[PDB]
């Protein structure tokens, strides 16, 4: 989920947009 | 842009940056 | 606990602290 | 809503708790 | 609420949240 | 002390109130 | 990505997120 | 400049990217 | 070092940086 | 006090140092 | 003052504190 | 560089001034 995409592994600002409403 | 490690309160700051007025959810158990 | 005056990212930091691993949703008006 | 209230006005940690998942 | 790890500047942000106008002390050598 | 209650180990928002004036 | 209203340290946090390991320069007017 | 613009007015992540090294 | 305009949590972050392991007390007026 | 001064007005790191333990 | 570990977003917050209006550069690849 | 002075190793507020413009 988000922790295991951008925290445990790394993620881009674009990937972070996956979690906007 | 870049890819970096974003954890905890830093991860939610980054969500607020990217999503802003759209809003977002932070659901780490998912 | 005391009452809070929280704007912008400061609200999201507060939600983060209050909710912990439960996570939260941030839903501003449009 | 909470976002606004907290900023224009004050809010409590207990009101914020309602937005936890 | 929850229990989480709160360190360094994050710990003092959480103290400011909880105590606010009451004030607080942050005394890690204690 | 506070570091070895909420940082090294974990602590609640209520336990943090132990350090208010 | 949404538009941003960022003052003080909040601008520097945003630059940090946006630039990553590239780093950045912070250059306010005098 | 960007510092001011962002504060008096709004700015985008894309404008901020111009200040990366 | 330059002079500082610091409100809310931003003051506490500054006290944290300035004091380090010495810790600090945050004592707002009532 | 310092809390107010810093916010209504400006303050220095040297004034802040007086609040260290 | 003190010496502590200052990383990532905390390091840039500390740069903003110390430099402020002078501005600064954050260039971790250096 | 700055990461290997204040992050990996530790550094003072005065050393941080090395990175002001
Ligand atoms: Cl603010
Ligand atoms: Cl950390
Ligand atoms: Zn702020
Ligand atoms: Zn951190």
mmCIF file of N, CA and C and ligand atoms in Angstrom, chain B residues 7 9-10, chain E residues 7 9-10, chain K residues 7 9-10, ligand 4:
data_model
loop_
_atom_site.group_PDB
_atom_site.id
_atom_site.type_symbol
_atom_site.label_atom_id
_atom_site.label_comp_id
_atom_site.label_asym_id
_atom_site.label_seq_id
_atom_site.Cartn_x
_atom_site.Cartn_y
_atom_site.Cartn_z
ATOM 1 N N UNK B 7 8.376 8.796 4.600
ATOM 2 C CA UNK B 7 7.792 8.030 5.710
ATOM 3 C C UNK B 7 7.044 8.894 6.725
ATOM 4 N N UNK B 9 5.198 11.273 9.020
ATOM 5 C CA UNK B 9 4.715 12.604 8.832
ATOM 6 C C UNK B 9 5.232 13.224 7.548
ATOM 7 N N UNK B 10 6.404 12.796 7.069
ATOM 8 C CA UNK B 10 6.913 13.326 5.812
ATOM 9 C C UNK B 10 6.114 12.888 4.613
ATOM 10 N N UNK E 7 9.997 10.883 17.713
ATOM 11 C CA UNK E 7 11.399 11.233 17.979
ATOM 12 C C UNK E 7 11.775 12.644 17.528
ATOM 13 N N UNK E 9 12.390 16.201 16.386
ATOM 14 C CA UNK E 9 11.502 17.281 16.096
ATOM 15 C C UNK E 9 10.054 16.831 16.040
ATOM 16 N N UNK E 10 9.801 15.563 15.702
ATOM 17 C CA UNK E 10 8.429 15.075 15.688
ATOM 18 C C UNK E 10 7.818 14.968 17.060
ATOM 19 N N UNK K 7 19.039 15.550 9.030
ATOM 20 C CA UNK K 7 18.893 14.842 7.751
ATOM 21 C C UNK K 7 17.656 15.258 6.957
ATOM 22 N N UNK K 9 14.566 16.548 5.188
ATOM 23 C CA UNK K 9 13.788 17.733 5.360
ATOM 24 C C UNK K 9 14.166 18.487 6.621
ATOM 25 N N UNK K 10 14.677 17.791 7.641
ATOM 26 C CA UNK K 10 15.102 18.482 8.851
ATOM 27 C C UNK K 10 16.325 19.338 8.651
HETATM 28 ZN ZN1 LIG M 4 11.597 13.204 10.323
#
